Amino acid sequence: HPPSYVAHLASDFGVRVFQQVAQASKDRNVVFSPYGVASVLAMLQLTTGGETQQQIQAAMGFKIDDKGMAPALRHLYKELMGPWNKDEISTTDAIFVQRDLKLVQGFMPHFFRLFRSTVKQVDFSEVERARFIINDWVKTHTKGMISNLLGKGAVDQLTRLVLVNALYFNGCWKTPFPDSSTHRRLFHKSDGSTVSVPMMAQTNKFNYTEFTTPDGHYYDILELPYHGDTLSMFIAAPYEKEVPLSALTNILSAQLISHWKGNMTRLPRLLVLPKFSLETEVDLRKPLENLGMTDMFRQFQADFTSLSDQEPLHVAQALQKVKIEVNESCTVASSSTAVIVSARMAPEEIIMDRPFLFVVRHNPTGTVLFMGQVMEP
Numbered sequence: 037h038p039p040s041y042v043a044h045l046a047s048d049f050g051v052r053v054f055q056q057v058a059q060a061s062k063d064r065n066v067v068f069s070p071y072g073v074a075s076v077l078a079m080l081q082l083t084t085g086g087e088t089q090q091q092i093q094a095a096m097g098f099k100i101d102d103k104g105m106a107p108a109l110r111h112l113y114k115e116l117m118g119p120w121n122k123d124e125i126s127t128t129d130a131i132f133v134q135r136d137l138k139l140v141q142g143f144m145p146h147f148f149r150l151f152r153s154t155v156k157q158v159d160f161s162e163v164e165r166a167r168f169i170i171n172d173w174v175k176t177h178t179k180g181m182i183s184n185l186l187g188k189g190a191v192d193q194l195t196r197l198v199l200v201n202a203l204y205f206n207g208c209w210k211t212p213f214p215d216s217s218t219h220r221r222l223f224h225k226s227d228g229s230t231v232s233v234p235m236m237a238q239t240n241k242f243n244y245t246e247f248t249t250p251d252g253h254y255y256d257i258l259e260l261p262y263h264g265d266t267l268s269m270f271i272a273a274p275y276e277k278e279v280p281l282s283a284l285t286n287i288l289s290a291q292l293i294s295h296w297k298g299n300m301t302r303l304p305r306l307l308v309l310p311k312f313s314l315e316t317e318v319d320l321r322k323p324l325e326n327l328g329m330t331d332m333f334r335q336f337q338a339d340f341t342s343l344s345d346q347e348p349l350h351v352a353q354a355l356q357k358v359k360i361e362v363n364e365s366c367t368v369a370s371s372s373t374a375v376i377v378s379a380r381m382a383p384e385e386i387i388m389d390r391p392f393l394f395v396v397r398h399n400p401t402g403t404v405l406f407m408g409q410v411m412e413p
């Protein structure tokens with residue numbers, strides 16, 4: 037096992053799924069979790085057989101069943117549930133299933149053995165009760181932060197199978213932003229218009245690098261450490277207002293991000309950054325079909341035989357919902373101000389007053405925990 041061999045495969049697949057999601061979200065805010073969807077699909081591997089299993093193993097690039105795959109994955113989850121987790125991130129996977137289905141012998145114990153947790157049984161014939169329960173389990177397993185994951189809308193008598201994934205993150209900066217150096221400021225939407233939003237400021241030695249699109253536009257990559265350095269945020273945007281964020285989105289990969297960090301250098305800057313707080317339900321169906329995982333939504337074609345042996349089964353709904361707060365510090369509404377040794381020495385100014393991209397990486401492993409674009413802060 038090359039170090040973090042699995043971790044790198046997951047984040048990877050996780051990033052690939054993300055492109056998909058960004059392609060479908062031009063001009064909208066999105067926050068997403070590469071890790072989450074990777075974990076949830078790894079689980080699903082066990083409920084599946086035939087081509088349905090194949091489509092996933094081919095898309096994820098490892099087989100959950102082989103030697104040390106599940107072993108390495110729970111260890112990953114442990115590293116991320118580390119003691120350093122001062123309640124910064126809550127995480128939840130859940131596979132829900134209609135209630136009177138003969139589960140194939142061995143499934144439960146096996147699932148518990150490789151994954152802990154278990155498949156949750158509910159009665160979808162009971163209308164709104166069933167979502168209510170799914171929504172409650174989700175709320176409580178994400179420190180109350182994510183509510184209505186399962187939409188008042190769809191899911192009916194006939195729904196028999198549903199995956200859910202949900203994360204919440206509110207991280208504590210290594211150096212958090214002065215409260216006093218936060219002031220209003222114009223943010224330029226992509227359509228050129230203009231909006232007055234609160235931007236944070238902090239002047240500091242950042243890790244920094246400048247890359248270029250294939251179409252020859254320059255763009256900034258900036259690393260923000262979180263406490264004790266387990267995680268970092270990466271911020272990226274094209275220099276030129278005129279350039280849509282897509283130029284970046286459409287080329288994002290796991291490897292690109294490596295190149296970014298690899299290629300960084302500590303440099304003094306003044307950083308103006310919008311304070312922001314996003315919550316996005318992502319529907320997984322299209323992104324997954326697009327990576328080859330078609331069978332799993334399809335009656336008469338999906339192969340759930342590793343789970344149930346009274347045929348008819350297919351995934352009704354595959355939802356991830358994510359909330360991320362970035363604003364000054366996780367801390368008791370009030371962060372360490374105000375210090376500044378600022379004459380006319382002014383270091384260069386990087387201002388995120390245009391749409392931009394963010395990435396939260398768990399540093400030892402390289403896992404992209406979260407990912408997103410800020411369109412209107």
Ligand SMILES: *[C@H]1O[C@H](CO[C@@H]2O[C@@H](C)[C@@H](O)[C@@H](O)[C@@H]2O)[C@@H](O[C@@H]2O[C@H](CO)[C@@H](O[C@@H]3O[C@H](CO[C@@H]4O[C@H](CO)[C@@H](O)[C@H](O)[C@@H]4O)[C@@H](O)[C@H](O)[C@@H]3O)[C@H](O)[C@H]2NC(C)=O)[C@H](O)[C@H]1NC(C)=O
Nearest residue numbers: 245246247248249250254292293294295296297298299300
């Ligand atoms: C930092 O980032 C660069 C990539 O970004 C470039 O450089 C930065 C600083 C900016 O100037 C950007 O605007 C640039 O785009 C990383 O560069 C990549 O690094 C690897 C080495 O790890 C190098 O791989 C080599 O590949 C060749 C042959 O294979 C290639 O295949 C591609 C297909 O995409 C082909 O088009 C390309 O021209 C190559 O022929 C082998 O000969 C070597 O054995 C080696 O494997 C990449 O090619 C290289 N890319 C570029 C554009 O330079 C650099 O590693 C990062 N630094 C750190 C510390 O990670």
Ligand SMILES: *[C@@H]1O[C@H](CO)[C@@H](O)[C@H](O)[C@H]1NC(C)=O
Nearest residue numbers: 241242243259260261297300
């Ligand atoms: C800058 O670069 C490397 C790896 O990210 C690390 O050794 C260093 O602590 C980083 N410093 C930051 C983000 O301030």
